[PDB]
Amino acid sequence: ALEVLFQGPGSGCYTYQVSRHSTEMLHNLNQQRKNGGRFCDVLLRVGDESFPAHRAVLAACSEYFESVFSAQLMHTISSKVFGDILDFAYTSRIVVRLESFPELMTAAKFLLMRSVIEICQEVIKQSNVQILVP
Amino acid sequence: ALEVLFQGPGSGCYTYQVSRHSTEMLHNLNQQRKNGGRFCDVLLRVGDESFPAHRAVLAACSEYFESVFSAQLMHTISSKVFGDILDFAYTSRIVVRLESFPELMTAAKFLLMRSVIEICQEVIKQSNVQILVP
Numbered sequence: 001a002l003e004v005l006f007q008g009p010g011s012g013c014y015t016y017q018v019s020r021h022s023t024e025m026l027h028n029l030n031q032q033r034k035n036g037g038r039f040c041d042v043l044l045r046v047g048d049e050s051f052p053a054h055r056a057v058l059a060a061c062s063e064y065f066e067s068v069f070s071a072q073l074m075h076t077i078s079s080k081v082f083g084d085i086l087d088f089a090y091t092s093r094i095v096v097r098l099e100s101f102p103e104l105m106t107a108a109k110f111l112l113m114r115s116v117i118e119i120c121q122e123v124i125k126q127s128n129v130q131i132l133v134p
Numbered sequence: 135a136l137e138v139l140f141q142g143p144g145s146g147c148y149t150y151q152v153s154r155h156s157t158e159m160l161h162n163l164n165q166q167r168k169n170g171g172r173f174c175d176v177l178l179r180v181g182d183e184s185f186p187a188h189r190a191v192l193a194a195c196s197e198y199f200e201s202v203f204s205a206q207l208m209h210t211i212s213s214k215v216f217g218d219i220l221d222f223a224y225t226s227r228i229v230v231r232l233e234s235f236p237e238l239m240t241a242a243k244f245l246l247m248r249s250v251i252e253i254c255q256e257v258i259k260q261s262n263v264q265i266l267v268p
Binding site for chain 1: 142146147148153155157162203227229
């Protein structure tokens with residue numbers, strides 16, 4: 001779990017690294033959210049469901065949320081697809097359902113989450129149907 | 135960067151994973167902190183220096199900070215060692231300086247950060263001087 005990645009910037013200094021640290025950090029943030037919304041400063045309501053979250057975490061993966069939180073402010077998004085998108089932000093894993101994949105694309109593009117957009121593009125590429133707009 | 139980790143919980147569903155996501159998430163949180171303290175809700179003052187941070191991030195790696203933030207509340211800690219400890223929480227990497235290693239142990243134990251305590255124990259183990267208290 002530990003590693004002397006580098007023998008330190010100077011003399012007598014050592015630089016360690018905990019490889020699992022970012023994974024555990026996100027896991028603990030996700031456990032905060034799912035256990036009552038500990039330390040969460042935003043409640044996201046989609047339909048009949050409310051989602052607690054951390055503004056800093058949404059801003060770190062979404063240009064849309066980053067800007068909305070900084071400004072104090074056709075493409076409907078369902079709570080199920082939005083819950084999958086939150087799950088990806090907090091776990092690095094997203095479920096792609098074919099029956100609701102059009103909704104996922106709509107949400108990913110509106111929320112400007114590059115990683116989810118790249119996953120959508122990968123699903124599109126695997127269909128072998130390339131879309132060229134001259 | 136993408137991976138079909140699993141062929142989905144059900145039928146027609148697919149489960150993707152972005153392995154670099156937790157690393158990028160922490161990196162973006164760290165860039166928030168270092169660029170003016172964006173989305174930071176706590177200012178940590180040690181001596182002549184102030185450190186902005188996210189309460190949720192400190193709580194996720196420190197039992198001490200988790201409890202202090204939830205309760206609204208001999209072992210002095212310097213700003214330099216404390217800045218290295220913040221750096222570890224936000225980057226997964228810590229610099230161990232021998233001249234200030236007693237301060238690091240004091241801070242790691244008071245802040246109850248297991249990963250930093252485990253690094254301290256590893257440095258102790260590498261000295262070949264085992265300390266047994268009967």
